[PDB]
């Protein structure tokens, strides 16, 4: 049974198809009229509404590919490709083809904030107004920003997704952009609108094919300095680079660093920069490009991070113009499909023309061919049935083998062969893709597989081709051109250099009911329902959502369609991986969210070494996810990748400690924004798992001497100052002091946020997202002292024993466990004698507990007062054994434990002074100082005495 | 007043980094205090 977890009405005209973006937590809902609605993944608020049409009257389909992190929008005529731009997708120009003439009116979609710096630059600093068409551009900018200003006040997530659109001729736009960049040159200050206008002129350059000059990558050809403000041009300069095998002289980090290849007779690896023109030759494999750029030109504005004309790869790949599959543009796309190869995308027309594109890098044509209907493999299958022959393509999929030569990717096309004997025969076609025992040419037919006879008898066609998750099996969906269709399961053959298919299918399922005809299908990852070839979720023609096991085609669950306020039949379904629920749309425009569905305690067992080793395995931590979804206030910016390159180089950037650094997100504050208080950072995790702690790094202003009162809080995302007051039940960690997490240097500081409520909060796996609110309690004001902020989220380490969570809850919850921990540490154990290694194990577990309810800092804090009480009960003994009998490592751990207790003693209301009783314990233990074994324990003893002697000085005066 | 910095980067994944920082600040503060006493006598 699958439960209906709420409903909202998305559109009045109905919904058609759904897609989901886990990296931004957004559902792309397509309506019946061709409009795509952007809906937030947990709140359900409509973030953006846009109408997409290359030509009027076409139906719109959208699909996201996870491995290339790109969303493909397909209408009847154009495909294109677009991707993420600083948290958003640019939709309004996603289906825009390049124009032919200069006077053609073009569309330019621009996000809100850099449109605001463009407006501020054009009003406060820049005079263009003698240029033609300036007033209409200014009017369009004002009207767009004023129309958006009503939408921005409803929600922050709606506010960040909005976009300004312009509708102007191309010559007016390039003249305005050229005037703006020339004025920003002669005014000559670092204004943030200069990269924006350089990007606008770059997009206008890509929007006309004849405005692009030919690439001058050759000996003797001079490259124009105007085209190298884009990073993509710097990337295509290195096509003839002689140092491909170099570790750091790869084309991408140094196209990122501003360098380009312009070879000369004096050097084949000759490389200069685009904005400072420093000339560098004779590259060695140990030269980092950023380090060499800073070394040979430290005065370069691109090295210093100032606002240059640099158009990065992100904006260019996020503003790719649409490409028609054919040159004429009057052709309708019959079908499209992306299979197990995520870097390739293919579309087919009505007469048999197939164009294959590569979507890893910038959107380009990989292969174009037309299917011949008189291929001898098809003629052989026609002969085997024993003359006008036509063939139509109904489905597409691109197949890659799961990981001496590696076998090449291949294309699968579903064909419906028509002949007069008028009879229809559905066939499957296998083609070769990659450019080069005769090797087949790309676009040639490899295998023509005939469907079994019931498809020809019932006049069926191939509806969907989707590979399975294991890379071994494949499912084919059949429908009528009355039986409800078929589900046919095939097996791929990997016995040779080309991926082929077995002729006999493994499993065939008959859909007898025409109301059970398949309308949409998605394949679930096997790891979700492990609490077998996988699981299949199918929406039917009658409106039923059915859960099917892929091995035996058995209905596991069934969801009836809702009733209209006639039944509102379900149309398409998508699985939201971030929130682990199924989004299903109806023909009435409603979206329905569907959710799929005594112990031995180690604290109660006697404490030998194996139990303590298990306990510290529960205490241990690790990094959590490669990247969590997080959006910002507009005053905070997402960092460039170049700063991460300064942290870790390119080979270290992937699968290394660069992954450990890109778990961290670096966010920098600008000083132009009016408010420096109430900044809210929402932190959406891609998958729910238990969180030990989160990090909070920051850099203070150097000029200010003392830090004013600033609070940092951590909150849950129950519903996606009075902001803390409405969410006072939603806090995990309490409001902590910023100076408590300050480093010994006043400039830098690291806050760690955790609580007992944080480690006991993950009860049902429900805490999908987190919130951070920062507030300064009341020239530099508010958060303007903080130039930088950085957040790292870490999890617990996975341990092999069953039921970790209830043992963690008993670990935080039991007073008796704390008492026996410190009792076995006092060495006054009634059973056995405690070894020093077992003591160190006890200190690790106990000080982990003390750190958790130290950093909690809540109001009641029974655990904090509790552990402080039983440490005050046995303080002389813990000081004696750790600082006299044990080694200096265990004495060091006890020193950190007692220092953390000094830290949490001030948050605890603390009627007996903890420093006073610690001083009393040490002054009780002075008479054993010559009898101590190791000198480091004496040193840490004296270090603790050095702080706690400031409370009562006469005790050490007499005794010392 | 401070002569030591640069805590180990394996500590920040641990929770007790603030405690080891306050120990390091404790040692540097007392070293500064005794040196300030020896200077402040003259």
Curated annotation (Swiss-Prot), chain B:
Location within or outside the cell: Golgi apparatus, trans-Golgi network membrane; Endosome; Cytoplasm, Cytoskeleton, Spindle pole; Cytoplasm, Cytoskeleton, Microtubule organizing center, Centrosome
Annotated knockout phenotype: Mice exhibit perinatal lethality and growth deficiencies, which are linked to a defect in proper placental development.
Known tissue expression: Widely expressed. Highly expressed in the brain and kidney.
Domain of life, source organism: Eukaryota
PTM statement from Swiss-Prot or TrEMBL: Ubiquitinated. Ubiquitination is mediated by RNF41 E3 ligase and leads to proteasomal degradation, impairing inhibition of apoptosis. Deubiquitinated by USP8/UBPY. Autoubiquitinated; mediated by E1 ubiquitin activating enzyme UBA6.
Assigned protein family: Belongs to the BIRC6 family.
Assembly information from the UniProt record: Homodimer; antiparallel. Interacts with DIABLO/SMAC, likely with higher affinity to SMAC dimer than SMAC monomer; this interaction blocks the substrate-binding site and inhibits the caspase inhibition activity of BIRC6. Interacts with RNF41, KIF23/MKLP1, USP8/UBPY, BIRC5/survivin, MAP2K1/MEK1, RAB8A/RAB8, RAB11A/RAB11, PLK1, EXOC3/SEC6 and EXOC4/SEC8.
Free-text note regarding domains: The BIR domain is essential for its anti-apoptotic function and is important for binding to DIABLO/SMAC and caspases.
Function: Anti-apoptotic protein known as inhibitor of apoptosis (IAP) which can regulate cell death by controlling caspases and by acting as an E3 ubiquitin-protein ligase. Unlike most IAPs, does not contain a RING domain and it is not a RING-type E3 ligase. Instead acts as a dual E2/E3 enzyme that combines ubiquitin conjugating (E2) and ubiquitin ligase (E3) activities in a single polypeptide. Ubiquitination is mediated by a non-canonical E1 ubiquitin activating enzyme UBA6.
Protein name listed in UniProt: Dual E2 ubiquitin-conjugating enzyme/E3 ubiquitin-protein ligase BIRC6
Protein source organism: Mus musculus
Gene name tied to this protein: Birc6
Segment of the intact protein contained: 2584 to 2625 of 4882
